[PDB]
Amino acid sequence: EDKEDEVADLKQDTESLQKQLEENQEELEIVGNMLREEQGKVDQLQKRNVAHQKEIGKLRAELGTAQRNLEKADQLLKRNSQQQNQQSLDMRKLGELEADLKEKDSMVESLTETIGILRKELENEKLKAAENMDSFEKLSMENENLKEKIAHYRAQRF
Amino acid sequence: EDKEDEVADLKQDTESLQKQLEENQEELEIVGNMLREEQGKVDQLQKRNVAHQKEIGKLRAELGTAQRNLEKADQLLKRNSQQQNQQSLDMRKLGELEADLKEKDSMVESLTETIGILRKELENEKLKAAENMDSFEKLSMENENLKEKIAHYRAQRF
């Protein structure tokens, strides 16, 4: 209480405490924004995150249908044992047939060769037959001349 | 009476102020945390997204091949099928052969018919020519016999 006591020390000091206030209010704005945007990002990332939830969804159906379908149409390629087994069943039935028929064809060829001979031996014995019965007539003829000549002797013939 | 009630007034001006810088730092305390907590949420979502996106590329290839396979094994169903074209022609045209067997079958049975007959007719032409050989010998034996009777008669000239 003597002329001057704590003059501006109180006056120019509230400005201190007042200016610090000037900041915490500014900065609180800066952080206020960053927050608005960082939570802004999460809006966009959170979205994309399901856009992928979807894309990845589809693929679980497609790689499934296509992997079990490779089995669905693979049982049909398992019939390659019934289809190639016939290469044993059929190559034999056709293989043995081309052999047992080509052969039975030589028979008919060997047989008709003999039917050809029997047709000839029975051809000649048809000739030697007529031919021999011929030598008989000449003899049958001469036979008579003799019966006569002898008949005359038993009587006539001076 | 005023120098005493002066610094008393600046107090209030500082009471109200010190409160603000305090109550305010509480807003800045929280709001600062809210921000970081979001940046936490962001950075990470930024990850699962790169996780999915990368792993969406894997399923993309697993689907790719798994499809080429469904087709690579399907060309093979076009070949397994066309062998049904040649296997059918083999099961139907092989039958013509087992059928062309009965043609030669009836032939070798039909020829042994004509071979059996000629062999039997050859036997009769032989039985016949066996008589003629006999009735001829009788004859020859008769003339030979007569010439002799005759030659005895000729014994009347001497």
UniProtKB/Swiss-Prot annotation, chains A, B:
It comes from the Eukaryota. Disruption phenotype: RNAi-mediated knockdown results in failed centrosome duplication in embryos. Residues 1-158 form a coiled coil. Keywords: Cell cycle, Coiled coil, Cytoplasm, Cytoskeleton, Developmental protein. One of its GO terms (molecular function) is identical protein binding. It is found in: Cytoplasm; Cytoplasm, Cytoskeleton, Microtubule organizing center, Centrosome, Centriole. The coiled coil domain is necessary and sufficient for interaction with sas-5. The 35 nM long coiled-coil domain mediates homodimerization while the globular N-terminus links the dimers at an angle of 40 degrees to form the inner ring. This is Spindle assembly abnormal protein 6. It comes from Caenorhabditis elegans.
